[PDB]
Design a protein around this ligand. Sequence first.
Ligand code: 6HE
Length: 153
Amino acid sequence: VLSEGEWQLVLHVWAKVEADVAGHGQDILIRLFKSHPETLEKFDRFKHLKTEAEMKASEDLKKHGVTVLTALGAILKKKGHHEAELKPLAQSHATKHKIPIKYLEFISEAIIHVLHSRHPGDFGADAQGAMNKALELFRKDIAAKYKELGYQG
Ligand code: 6HE
């Protein structure tokens, strides 16, 4: 479990995301797609995008980044008590979208990448460690739900 102090490090940094969810979302999805291009193929609406410029200009990709970070932010704000939030997310991502845990690791890495990039003076090792622990917990719990749902992930 994360300590309360660890959750406060997580939520202090997420409050930065909350100032500009859309812009953080764009950065995160673009980082994901550039670092792991196979992930882009999972998105039927977005897999035609050829360049970062096209990704930045996509209003629908911007909207999707808001969708993703809105969901993740609610999960983080539960401070581990996220069972209800993970049910629909796990079901769609296991059954419909077919997103392996390794791809959830990739987007976690992108989130951390972007936080470190955007917030160079207020995202140190301890804050990054706490964010990592929160994302690890999310993935652990999603993986358990994937198994319950019948997906190997
Ligand atoms: C590599 C692909 C990938 C990865 C890593 C994710 N997703 Fe997912 N995603 C999320 C939401 C709220 C929705 C719309 C409702 C739904 O269909 O469930 C989608 C839809 C989608 C859709 C339509 C697709 C293809 C999808 N998501 C691929 C996808 C949230 C997330 C979150 C919170 C994460 C991880 C932090 C995430 N996605 C990682």
